[PDB]
RNA sequence: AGCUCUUUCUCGAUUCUGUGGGUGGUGGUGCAUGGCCGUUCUUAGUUGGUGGAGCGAUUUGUCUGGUUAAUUCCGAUAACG
């Protein structure tokens with residue numbers, strides 16, 4: 001937003017640079033060109049943070065406008081985003097899908113997995129292409145976290161970030177939960193949040 | 208074989224004559240058919256409902272790979288059941 005209550009604070013830029021979310025890929029595509037600051041001395045692109053923040057608050061403003069919280073289905077297929085989507089759906093009452101997608105869940109009126117969402121959030125356009133291709137049949141908008149080499153086909157609100165590393169992905173889902181819960185009422189601003197981002201990170205099997 | 212011929216007793220309305228019409232047939236057609244059987248074919252093969260691809264005949268599901276006597280399973284997965 002244009003305001004000052006919605007502006008990025010110094011405590012969040014440290015969370016960003018600590019998770020590494022500013023660090024892009026090696027290849028750029030001509031649709032993500034407005035989100036890049038400059039290519040490093042070695043071949044890697046820096047993502048502009050102020051632009052990440054504005055696209056993240058636009059996604060939150062798109063999610064808050066849906067009345068029933070339970071038709072904002074969230075999807076992750078890679079192993080890094082499963083815990084994050086499960087915790088995001090818990091914190092704000094969406095319906096998560098981790099693992100395989102079982103094509104036809106959006107367009108098949110027999111299956112027991114058939115639902116009719118009203119939004120669609122997704123971790124990675126290039127790894128969860130089946131939900132996008134199916135959303136392209138039932139008038140279904142889409143929000144997506146994009147790496148610097150993400151194809152922006154059928155996505156409607158791309159959020160630029162490092163999409164590869166587990167810490168980055170969990171931090172982005174945590175911040176998306178923070179800002180929907182903030183502007184819906186609920187956990188009012190001028191307080192830190194009870195949950196720490198590490199509840200949202202990938203497990204990466206332990207000792 | 209009263210089959211027929213010579214001869215002339217016996218039976219009793221059941222027949223006989225003619226016209227229609229039936230009846231029977233190990234007669235014809237298995238290239239008019241039912242049913243049964245044999246064989247393709249002793250192997251692992253077949254099919255539709257909703258969804259996806261194609262203008263369409265069609266295709267996916269019914270599979271790269273491993274496994275099994277086996278489309279038997281494990282799995283992979285625009286398919287689900």
Ligand SMILES: [Mg+2]
Nearest residue numbers: 229230231232
């Ligand atoms: Mg006859």
Ligand SMILES: [Mg+2]
Nearest residue numbers: 231232233234
């Ligand atoms: Mg006969």
Ligand SMILES: [Mg+2]
Nearest residue numbers: 237238240245
């Ligand atoms: Mg015959």
Ligand SMILES: [Mg+2]
Nearest residue numbers: 237240242243
């Ligand atoms: Mg016959």
Ligand SMILES: [Mg+2]
Nearest residue numbers: 257258259266
């Ligand atoms: Mg069809």
Ligand SMILES: [Mg+2]
Nearest residue numbers: 259260261262
């Ligand atoms: Mg068609």
Ligand SMILES: [Mg+2]
Nearest residue numbers: 266267268269
């Ligand atoms: Mg077939």
Ligand SMILES: [Mg+2]
Nearest residue numbers: 274275276277
């Ligand atoms: Mg064998």
Ligand SMILES: [Mg+2]
Nearest residue numbers: 280281282283
């Ligand atoms: Mg299986």
